């Protein structure tokens, strides 16, 4: 329970907020997708295609284990699915970057939707969104409204840390 872990959907801007936060609080910033992708020598798309989702999820689960040994606190941005690992419990204080369905759908591109059929019909897209939101909300210490831009998300994270310094 040492780090500030940002969770949420693709496109909620976790990374960007993570970096800002690193600067703000004088802390190192890590990114789970970047770690795994720089290791394997492939992008994340390329991993799922070349290696399979199961294999990525194993890298991911393993990587959580590693990060729980870091000594100093860091700000960690995480991939969308990371919240599926029981393992993630104990890594740190999770903040959900809450973004709305409409804007998250608009933020996806063609390559993203090309390979995931659930994103292409309304009904399933919403159903997916609802069940995974509930999973981010379950697993979150703080919910952050990301709809107001990065600065406003940053102001909320800092509010909470101002109030409970045991966090950082
Ligand atoms: N509570 C949960 C549980 C599972 C999630 C989850 O599995 C996610 N992403 N999943 C996939 C699965 C297959 C993919 C696939 O086969 C290709 C690509 S890609 O070409 O765009 O890189 C991305 C893929 C993302 C995302 S979330 O959408 O990442 O938020 C969020 C999730 C949130």
Author numbering: 1 to 168
From the paper:
SK catalyzes the specific phosphorylation of the 3-hydroxyl group of shikimic acid, using ATP as a co-substrate. The shikimate pathway is comprised of seven enzymatic components that convert erythrose 4-phosphate and phosphoenolpyruvate into chorismate, for subsequent synthesis of aromatic compounds. SKs belong to a class of P-loop kinases that share a homologous α-β-α fold. Overall, these structures have a characteristic α-β-α fold that consists of the CORE domain (residues 1–31, 61–108, and 124–162), the SB domain (residues 32–60), and the LID region (residues 109–123) in the monomer.
We also determined the X-ray structure of the E114A mutant SK-inhibitor complex using a selective inhibitor (NSC162535; IC50 = 4.9 µM) identified from virtual docking analysis. After extensive trials, only the map of the E114A·162535 crystal showed a large piece of residual density in the binding pocket, which could be modeled as NSC162535. The final E114A·162535 crystal structure shows a trimeric assembly (R = 21.8%, Rfree = 26.2%). NSC162535, which is clearly observed in two of the three subunits, exhibits an extended conformation between LID and SB. Interestingly, it extends out to the entrance of the binding pocket. The LID loop of HpSK accommodates the inhibitor by undergoing a large conformational switch, distinct from that of HpSK·SO4 and HpSK• S3P•ADP. Notably, the side chain of R116 at LID forms hydrogen bonds with an SO4 group and packs against one of the naphthalene moieties with an electron-rich π system. This naphthalene group also packs against the aromatic ring of F48 from the SB domain on the other side, establishing strong cation-π and π-π interactions. The other naphthalene group interacts with the side chain of R132, yielding a cation-π interaction. Additionally, the guanidino groups of R116 and R57 are located near the diazo moiety of NSC162535, making cation-π interaction and a kind of polar interaction, respectively.
